Design a protein around this ligand. Structure first.
Ligand code: HEM
Ligand code: HEM
Ligand SMILES: [C-]#N
Ligand SMILES: [C-]#N
Ligand SMILES: [Ca+2]
Lengths: 144, 147
């Protein structure tokens, strides 16, 4: 059972189901080390140009710190925003939710740039929570 | 006994999102074993009093029974008009429009996610079927991994 592939399929589904241009999932350990980073909407050449993987700083760092849903009209405007690295696609609208089970949170599922230029909806948020939950069971199952 | 609580919350959340996403009046999911024996059932859209009047849970017969045995997407304008249909039990809401999809992974199917009575009064669309398939595949990842 390839967990990386499983998490990637979840991200793929999330991006499609809520019409985001971009989607990503980070999964970390308790020491906040990056275990998995999977994504959709970004070409391999761009990925290469970005270079270093995200470390879970800024806005995602906020959700790792306090796991709960967060929608933003403009992720750059958030006080905690660290900004994009060189070569990274610019992104504006944002939806992120923990990837968890009841006992523990392991990750964050996040989507940007809904293709209609609108912020993500309440319904979008609830849907992504549901997909996140399926991911959470996968992660919990890989741990113990 | 009871479903694993994380699995149960997940499967409930999926039914809920599916029901909202495709504008269905009612939404349900059955999960069965490899012998096709129904083990768990979750649903939404039916009040507690009605559930009490209905009484017995579904056994995986009729149209859902068909989908358990031959797992693939099925849309119907009028579910009770299908040749495999067994009919609604006493006190069950009558239901017309139907969308049902298997809950599965590559090598195994565990269940069926199904929705009825789209609120616009129309049948469920191609778009509806595609999206509910995506929610069902997520349910499949969850079932396979709770296990
Ligand atoms: C395609 C899906 C992606 C999404 C939705 C996404 C989203 C974001 C967002 C919203 C930020 C800003 C956070 C802030 O301002 O605080 C950010 C920063 C960042 N991104 Fe991405 N990104 C994606 C792909 C990638 C890829 C492929 C890489 C590199 C392989 C990457 C590397 C980074 C890095 C290094 C940061 C700085 C913050 C950190 O290290 O945590 N991103 N990303
Ligand atoms: C609210 C979500 C529900 C949906 C979408 C739904 C859908 C359906 C449909 C379409 C049928 C017809 C099958 C056929 O004619 O072959 C059916 C039958 C049946 N329903 Fe439901 N129903 C729901 C709730 C319930 C509840 C809450 C109960 C019990 C408390 C129940 C008990 C039954 C039983 C016993 C049958 C006969 C077939 C069988 O045993 O599997 N249903 N349902
Ligand atoms: C992007 N992390
Ligand atoms: C009703 N099953
Ligand atoms: Ca709607």
């Amino acid at each position: 059972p390839d967990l990386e592939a499983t998490l990637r399929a979840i991200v793929h589904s999330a991006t499609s189901l809520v019409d985001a241009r971009y989607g990503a999932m980070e999964v970390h350990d308790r020491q906040h080390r990056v275990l998995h980073f999977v994504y959709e909407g970004i070409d391999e050449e761009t990925v290469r140009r970005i270079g270093h993987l995200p470390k879970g700083l800024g806005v995602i760092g906020l959700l790792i710190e306090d796991p709960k849903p967060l929608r933003l009209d403009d992720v750059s405007a958030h006080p905690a925003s660290i900004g994009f690295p060189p070569y990274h696609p610019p992104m504006r609208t944002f939806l992120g939710v923990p990837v968890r089970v009841r006992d523990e949170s392991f990750g964050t599922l996040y989507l940007t740039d809904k293709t209609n230029g609108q912020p993500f909806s309440d319904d979008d948020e609830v849907l992504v929570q549901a997909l996140a939950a399926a991911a959470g069971i996968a992660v919990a199952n890989a741990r113990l």
